């Protein structure tokens, strides 16, 4: 008897070794571990009358190959070991599957339940097996019951889903290859040096967004306004109140403050109310990335990778989802009972106490009807490495928080009417009455104020106060989380790809990490400006989202993949035309960028001068400065030197402006 000898079997293709193992244990109490080409795979002789072999793909086994040089109109699937030397290790997975496929009765794609898994399984079965004998397992968690359920409900492959993923891969590859070679070729022909440059259908509009926002930030000048704070003596309290009215000119604010001193104020309304602070909804992937970035500093790409690992451990549901809902087809009770039998037992006892034993998900807005929100399966976490445990604990507490109870806050608002004036201002304080979910998803601080006890009709006096200057503020620099939110909001990429695009931008050195903020490098800056200057259509956020909408329509059967491919060729042909025209200037710009041809540098940076010895950005900085100073003068009456000092001292002031300002203060 040969343990690993089998015939007349269905071949089940899984994406990862852990998923293959999980599927084997779902199908048999004694699955057989085999090894060939140094790859572990599983034989199921036990399940019903049929036999099964479960093999991991390890990831993509196929990649796109096209023409060399520029332009590239074609993209065809080839084994990755043949076309990508960083992927020759996959050859052994390719060999195993090809060997097991010849003697197979049929094929089951059990890759992950997203578009990538549909493509991976399709390419493998189509090329190594028989596509006409192909079925799809669609599961959202690697629990025995979810796997068995999907095995029982095996369906045809979803060719519309497959075509949507193929279309996105081919269109992404075609745009990246063509634009990146067009850039490198224009430099080779103009400076005779070859440097590696990259571009992407989503990377490039993303880099342009960041560069444009960094320019705007670097040209920002805080403008002044004035606020009035008053001190109200009423009963035993001394209340510092910031008045809700703002003033452009300092004289209007002084006027306003002085007519309030020594006036009487009367409590004319008291409002005591209990406010709800709703328990959170279960994570979709973006929400998880956002929260794990804020709390632990884990990058979006790593959050997704870690969540995928936890799903492969059977600990959470599949994390590539937009949904913030848990439908009734998911047993909350089973999850809760699982967590009760784990290190989360005491947290579950607390949720039981908070709810009385009634566990109701606070359903979020976003849906994804085939892909529920991220939640724990109820299987017990054990021995989790550090970053894994942080992510699992986030997901578990978010879920447990979502089935607990809304928090309650007591609010008291006093309305105070000034004597002789049509003006009334408020004093308010909030206290936590019931913490509830705040003790479960304990990552949300609630500001509490010391109580203030006043009755309707109580009177006091405004005894003192101050006019205070308030400087306008720049839009914040991007964080990874903040950039990721912009991508989601603009519908660039998918929630599965956005985190990787951000990481690819850093790896290829167009972006860099300055603390929590992600800023351009010089190279990223130049590439963004070049793409902006010469190829605005390919970095237009609206047109990128347009393409995203067409890709989404392939999934529904509403548009043909072949039609999106044709339309993309049309777009490439338009890029080709624009490239022939501008190629020499594109190459010249790239040359200046890397110091390859000497330029007359700006007085304050390395960019090429534009006017007055200033680059285009420092020149705009000066224009903005002159106008901002005028606004400062009209509003504050400060003299020139003092306005400059106040702009120079504010960290809101862009660096281009700050260069100009420091110069003018150094002048004589």
* Contacts with Zn ion, residue ranges (CB under 5 A): 602, 605, 607, 615, 618
570: which residues sit within 8 A by CB, 6+ positions away?
none
Closer to Zn ion by CB, 249 or 655: give it: 655
Q: How far is the CB of 591 from Zn ion (least distance, A)?
A: 19
Q: Between residues 107 and 656, which has the closer beta carbon with respect to Zn ion?
A: 656
Contacts of 421 (CB under 8 A, 6+ apart): 259, 260, 263
Residue 214 or 495: which CB sits closer to Zn ion? 214
Looking at the Cβ atoms of 39 and 607, the one nearer to Zn ion is 607
| Pair 86, 68: CB distance under 8 Å | no
CB distance 636 to 643 below 8 Å: yes
SS (H, E, C) 498-553: HHHHHHHHHHCCCEEEECCEEEECHHHHHHHHHHHHHCHHHHCHHHHHHHHHHHHH
Nearer to Zn ion, 157 or 602 (CB): 602
C-alpha to C-alpha distances, 71 to 34, 68, 280, 543, 544, nearest whole angstrom = 46, 8, 50, 21, 21
Q: Is 393 helix (H, G, I), strand (E, B) or coil?
A: helix
Taking the complex as a whole, how short is the minimal distance between the CB of residue 586 and Zn ion, in angstroms?
21
What's the closest the beta carbon of residue 624 comes to Zn ion, in angstroms?
14
Q: Residue 536 CB, nearest distance to Zn ion (Å)? A: 23
DSSP lists the bridge partners of residue 64 as 77
Q: What is the CA radius of gyration of the chain?
A: 31
CB of 498 to Zn ion, least distance (A): 32
**Residue 463 or 605 having the CB closest to Zn ion:** 605
Does residue 585 contact residue 530 with C-beta atoms inside 8 Å? no
- Give the C-alpha separation, 340 to 380, whole Å: 9
Q: Which is nearer to Zn ion, 131 or 623 (CB)?
A: 623
Residues 284 and 374 sit within 8 Å (Cβ to Cβ): yes
Q: What is the largest CA-CA distance in the chain?
A: 103
Length of the chain: 668
Cβ atoms within 10 Å, residue 593: 23
CB of 440 to Zn ion, least distance (A): 52
Contact between 59 and 15 (Cβ < 8 Å):
yes
Between 191 and 605, CB nearer to Zn ion: 605
Of residues 58 and 661, the one with the C-beta less far from Zn ion: 661
Smallest distance, Å, CB 621 to Zn ion? 8
Q: Do residues 494 and 545 touch, judged by C-beta distance below 8 A?
A: no
The string of DSSP codes covering 54-85 is: EEE--S--EEEE--SSS-----EEEEHHHH-G
Under 8 Å between Cβ of 156 and 135: yes
The three-state secondary structure class of 113 is: coil
What sign does the CA torsion over 522, 525, 527, 533 have?
A: negative
Task: State in angstroms the smallest separation of the CB of 614 from Zn ion.
Answer: 6
* Residue among 194 and 611 whose Cβ is closer to Zn ion: 611
Task: Select 51 or 616, whichever has its Cβ closest to Zn ion.
Answer: 616
Q: Are residues 579 and 182 in contact, defined by beta-carbon separation less than 8 angstroms?
A: yes
């Amino acid at each position: 008897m040969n343990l690993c000898n089998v015939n007349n079997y269905y071949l089940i293709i899984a994406e990862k070794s852990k998923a293959a193992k999980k599927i084997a244990e779902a199908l048999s109490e004694k699955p057989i571990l085999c090894r060939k080409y140094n790859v572990s795979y599983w034989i199921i002789k036990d399940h019903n009358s049929s036999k099964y072999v479960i093999v991991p793909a390890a990831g993509h086994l196929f990649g796109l190959k096209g023409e060399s040089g520029f332009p590239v109109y074609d993209a065809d699937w080839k084994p990755l070991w043949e076309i990508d030397k960083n992927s020759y290790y996959t050859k052994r997975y390719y060999q195993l599957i090809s060997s097991l496929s010849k003697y197979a009765l049929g094929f089951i794609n059990a890759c992950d339940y997203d578009i990538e898994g549909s493509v991976i399984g399709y390419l493998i079965i189509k090329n190594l097996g028989d596509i006409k004998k192909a079925k799809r397992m669609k599961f959202s968690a690697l629990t025995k019951s979810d796997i068995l359920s999907a095995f029982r409900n095996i369906s045809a492959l979803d060719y519309d889903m497959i075509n949507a993923g193929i279309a996105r891969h081919k269109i992404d590859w075609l745009w990246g290859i063509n634009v990146s070679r067009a850039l490198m070729i224009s430099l080779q022909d103009f400076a005779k040096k070859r440097v590696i440059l990259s571009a992407g259908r989503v990377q490039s509009p993303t880099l342009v967004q960041v560069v444009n926002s960094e320019i705007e930030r670097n040209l920002f000048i805080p403008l002044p306004k004035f606020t009035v704070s008053i001190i109200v003596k009423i009963k035993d309290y001394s209340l510092n109140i910031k008045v809700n009215k703002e003033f452009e000119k300092i004289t209007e604010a002084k006027e306003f403050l002085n007519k309030l001193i020594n006036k009487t104020v009367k409590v004319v309304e008291v409002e005591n109310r209990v406010r709800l602070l709703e328990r959170p909804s279960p994570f979709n992937l973006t929400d998880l990335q956002i929260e794990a970035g804020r709390i632990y500093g884990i990058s979006p790409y790593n959050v997704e990778r870690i969540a995928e690992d936890l799903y492969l451990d059977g600990l959470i549901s599949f994390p590539r989802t937009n949904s913030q809902k848990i439908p009734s087809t998911i047993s909350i009770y089973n999850i809760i009972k699982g967590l009760e039998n784990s290190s989360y037992r005491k947290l579950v006892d607390l949720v039981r106490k908070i709810t009385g034993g009634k566990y109701v998900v606070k359903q979020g807005i976003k849906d994804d009807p085939a892909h529920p929100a991220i939640h724990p399966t109820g299987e017990a976490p054990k021995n989790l490495p550090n970053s894994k445990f942080k992510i699992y604990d986030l997901i578990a507490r978010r879920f447990l928080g979502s089935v607990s109870a809304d928090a309650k806050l007591s609010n008291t608002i006093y309305t105070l009417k000034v004597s002789d004036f049509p003006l009334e201002f408020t004093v308010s304080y909030t206290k936590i009455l019931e913490r509830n979910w705040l003790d479960i998803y304990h990552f949300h601080n609630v500001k509490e104020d010391k109580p203030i006890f006043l009755s309707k009709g109580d009177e006091g006096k405004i005894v003192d106060g101050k006019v205070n200057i308030s400087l306008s503020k720049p839009t914040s620099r991007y964080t990874k989380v903040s950039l990721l939110k912009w991508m989601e909001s603009s519908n660039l990429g998918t929630e599965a790809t956005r985190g990787r695009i951000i990481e690819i931008l850093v790896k290829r050195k167009y972006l860099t990490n300055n603390g929590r903020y992600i800023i351009p490098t010089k190279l990223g800056f130049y590439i963004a400006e070049i793409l902006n200057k010469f190829f605005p259509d390919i970095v237009d956020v609206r047109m990128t989202a347009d393409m995203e909408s067409k890709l989404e329509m392939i999934k529904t059967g509403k548009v043909l993949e072949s039609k999106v491919i044709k339309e993309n060729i049309e777009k490439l042909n338009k890029f080709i035309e624009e490239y022939k025209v501008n190629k020499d200037k594109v190459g010249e710009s790239l040359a200046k960028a890397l110091g390859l041809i000497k330029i007359v540098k700006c007085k304050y940076c390395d960019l090429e001068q534009y006017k007055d010895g200033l680059c285009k950005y420092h020149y705009e900085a000066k224009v903005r400065l002159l106008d901002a100073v005028e606004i400062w003068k009209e509003r504050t009456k400060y003299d020139h030197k003092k306005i400059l000092k106040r702009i120079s001292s504010s960290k809101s002031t862009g660096k281009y402006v700050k260069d100009i300002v420091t110069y003018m203060l150094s002048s004589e």
